[PDB]
Amino acid sequence: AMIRKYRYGAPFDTEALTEKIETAEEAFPYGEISQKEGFAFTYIMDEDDIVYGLGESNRGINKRGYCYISNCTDDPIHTEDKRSLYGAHNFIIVSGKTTFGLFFDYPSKLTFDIGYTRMDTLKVSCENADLDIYVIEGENAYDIVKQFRRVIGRSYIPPKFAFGFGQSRWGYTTKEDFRAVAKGYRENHIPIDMIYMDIDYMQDFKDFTVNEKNFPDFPEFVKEMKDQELRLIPIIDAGVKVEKGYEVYEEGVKNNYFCKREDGSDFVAAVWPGDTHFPDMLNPEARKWFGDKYRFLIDQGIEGFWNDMNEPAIFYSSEGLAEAKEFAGEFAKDTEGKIHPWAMQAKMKDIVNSPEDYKRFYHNVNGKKIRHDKVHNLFGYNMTRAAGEAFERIDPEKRFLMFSRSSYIGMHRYGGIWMGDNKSWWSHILLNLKMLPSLNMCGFMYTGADLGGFGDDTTRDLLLRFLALGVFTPLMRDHAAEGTREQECYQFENIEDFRSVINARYRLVPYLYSEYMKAALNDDMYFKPLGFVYPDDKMAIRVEDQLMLGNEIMIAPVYEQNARGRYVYLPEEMKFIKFMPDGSISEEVLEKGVHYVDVALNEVPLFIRSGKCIPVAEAAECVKDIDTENMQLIGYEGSSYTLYEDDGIHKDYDKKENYRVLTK
Ligand SMILES: OCCN1C[C@H](O)[C@@H](O)[C@H](O)[C@H]1CO
Numbered sequence: 232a233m234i235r236k237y238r239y240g241a242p243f244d245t246e247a248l249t250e251k252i253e254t255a256e257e258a259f260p261y262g263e264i265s266q267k268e269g270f271a272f273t274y275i276m277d278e279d280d281i282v283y284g285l286g287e288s289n290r291g292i293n294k295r296g297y298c299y300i301s302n303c304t305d306d307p308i309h310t311e312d313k314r315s316l317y318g319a320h321n322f323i324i325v326s327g328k329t330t331f332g333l334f335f336d337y338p339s340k341l342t343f344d345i346g347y348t349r350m351d352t353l354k355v356s357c358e359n360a361d362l363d364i365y366v367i368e369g370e371n372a373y374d375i376v377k378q379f380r381r382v383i384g385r386s387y388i389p390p391k392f393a394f395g396f397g398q399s400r401w402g403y404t405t406k407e408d409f410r411a412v413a414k415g416y417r418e419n420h421i422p423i424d425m426i427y428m429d430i431d432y433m434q435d436f437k438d439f440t441v442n443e444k445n446f447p448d449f450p451e452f453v454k455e456m457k458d459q460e461l462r463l464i465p466i467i468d469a470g471v472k473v474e475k476g477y478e479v480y481e482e483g484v485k486n487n488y489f490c491k492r493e494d495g496s497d498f499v500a501a502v503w504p505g506d507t508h509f510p511d512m513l514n515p516e517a518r519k520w521f522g523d524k525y526r527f528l529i530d531q532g533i534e535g536f537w538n539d540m541n542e543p544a545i546f547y548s549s550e551g552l553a554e555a556k557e558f559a560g561e562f563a564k565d566t567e568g569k570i571h572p573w574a575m576q577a578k579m580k581d582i583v584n585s586p587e588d589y590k591r592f593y594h595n596v597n598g599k600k601i602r603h604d605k606v607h608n609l610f611g612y613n614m615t616r617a618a619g620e621a622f623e624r625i626d627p628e629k630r631f632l633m634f635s636r637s638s639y640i641g642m643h644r645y646g647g648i649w650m651g652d653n654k655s656w657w658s659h660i661l662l663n664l665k666m667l668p669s670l671n672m673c674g675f676m677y678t679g680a681d682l683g684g685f686g687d688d689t690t691r692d693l694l695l696r697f698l699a700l701g702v703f704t705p706l707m708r709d710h711a712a713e714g715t716r717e718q719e720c721y722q723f724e725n726i727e728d729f730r731s732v733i734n735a736r737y738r739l740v741p742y743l744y745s746e747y748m749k750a751a752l753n754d755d756m757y758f759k760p761l762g763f764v765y766p767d768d769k770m771a772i773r774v775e776d777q778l779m780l781g782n783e784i785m786i787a788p789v790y791e792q793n794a795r796g797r798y799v800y801l802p803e804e805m806k807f808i809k810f811m812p813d814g815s816i817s818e819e820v821l822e823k824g825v826h827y828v829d830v831a832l833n834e835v836p837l838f839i840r841s842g843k844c845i846p847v848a849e850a851a852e853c854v855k856d857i858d859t860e861n862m863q864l865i866g867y868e869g870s871s872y873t874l875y876e877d878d879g880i881h882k883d884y885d886k887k888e889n890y891r892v893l894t895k
């Protein structure tokens with residue numbers, strides 16, 4: 232009703248929305264539209280306007296002052312200059328005197344020039360005028376986000392164990408590796424629920440295999456781990472290894488389930504297994520086939536998966552590599568200095584994630600051929616869709632843990648996302664924080680970043696501050712790249728500080744799970760910018776390093792090295808709470824306004840809003856062992872809290888039995 236859909240040309244059906252909106256037949260209601268050069272929408276912003284949205288994208292909560300390109304890309308260096316990361320989340324909200332939301336339902340490269348060229352000018356452009364643009368009206372940004380959340384369908388809901396702590400590393404390969412992790416945590420009584428299995432668990436990186444040498448009785452290992460409340464979470468990649476006798480490959484070739492070149496052959500992309508084919512994720516029969524392969528792991532006791540490299544990432548194509556070797560032979564023969572090393576270096580970089588390669592393969596959509604670049608940002612989304620749909624077919628009532636690196640709006644119904652390859656940088660604590668509300672606006676609630684940083688070398692104090700933010704993010708996972716300084720919690724001196732921080736997570740799990748469930752079930756946000764909760768407070772609307780969570784608390788993590796506290800702005804009176812390393816809970820009332828709060832490395836801070844309280848459990852070492860029967864309430868006298876809790880396993884969300892009222 233307050234949502235209208237403006238159709239240009241003949242757009243591709245992304246299935247991002249679950250709700251049907253009729254095509255509007257009036258002139259576009261904001262700014263101006265031009266087709267002189269592909270498609271461009273231009274809008275002149277007021278100087279006080281804030282722009283929210285874009286889900287997983289670079290920089291801040293207010294998107295003004297830079298350029299953002301929705302073009303799912305495998306880029307491990309998230310510096311401020313980058314215009315594209317892994318996600319394509321084409322929803323923005325202009326917020327000010329004039330307020331409206333826009334969703335550009337377009338599956339290809341889409342450029343958001345948000346004051347980059349001229350500060351007052353918002354320009355959104357793409358190559359082809361074949362798209363739907365949804366215009367959402369409302370009193371404020373928050374109401375517009377809520378309408379949007381309604382029409383894109385309910386967010387993915389994880390199983391409760393996924394709210395525990397998880398540990399992973401690109402490098403764990405053998406039973407011994409995994410047992411050392413289990414032992415490193417359990418014998419030091421650091422809580423944990425999950426261990427991630429990265430690409431080395433497979434036989435030569437073949438999807439839907441297990442290295443039968445390292446795991447000759449894999450279901451028995453899965454049980455050994457699960458008996459200790461440790462759930463193994465295996466990676467699945469986009470590329471299917473080319474290899475004779477490998478059933479997944481053979482089936483794919485025989486039934487034409489792979490993406491093909493223009494000449495009809497199966498396109499070759501080299502990734503971890505060397506030569507691979509990509510399953511045609513936009514083909515329904517291929518998707519059913521590919522998703523059903525997950526049963527191979529599910530039958531073995533596996534309850535969760537993560538999907539990687541699904542941009543899809545390409546190290547090189549056969550075509551790219553041939554050009555590379557040819558160039559290199561010229562370089563090698565050059566004696567006159569006609570070919571500089573720089574040109575040689577550039578060619579080598581050019582064959583990776585090449586825009587040319589994305590034009591070299593096609594999807595078969597219900598019989599019709601579509602060049603991949605035209606639908607590039609739909610790939611990772613449909614790979615995760617394939618898995619989610621398969622889960623429904625095998626056990627309609629069971630929640631599986633599922634999250635994906637690349638995504639597009641619509642995928643939020645089928646899995647979460649992690650924020651990809653960050654770095655052990657202090658700036659990435661803050662980057663992690665700012666991405667949270669924007670993802671929430673776009674449907675992606677189950678999210679998190681690699682705690683401690685994926686690439687480069689972490690330090691003890693950096694890992695502790697990351698963990699203290701991760702305490703509040705639904706996906707809380709310590710994961711590192713190969714070759715990095717080891718960053719399992721037991722690798723550092725005074726490990727009692729890591730126990731204290733992760734203890735805080737487990738004490739908060741019933742509250743955090745409850746808020747997640749209440750928000751997901753009501754198409755609402757888990758994390759919100761302060762401006763959404765205090766929209767009449769000009770100071771509050773511009774705060775970017777604090778977030779509101781549910782309706783009870785605010786978080787404000789320390790993200791500066793050597794800092795012993797940080798500044799905060801409280802838009803109302805709050806109780807400043809700290810989980811202390813001795814197990815106690817420090818509390819102090821603070822009035823509305825500016826404060827510097829002391830927060831030590833081994834203290835986890837939060838703020839409880841006036842007239843609110845939250846339940847806190849005693850610390851336990853796995854989700855199953857959390858005692859929720861008579862939790863302590865922290866916060867304001869005379870307040871109450873409605874706890875959501877179900878069995879954490881099935882999908883019986885609609886019971887009054889799931890809710891109970893607690894009173895301080
Ligand atoms: O080329 C790298 C592929 N992968 C990228 C993922 O983002 C990361 O989490 C993972 O550890 C890594 C190895 O599986």
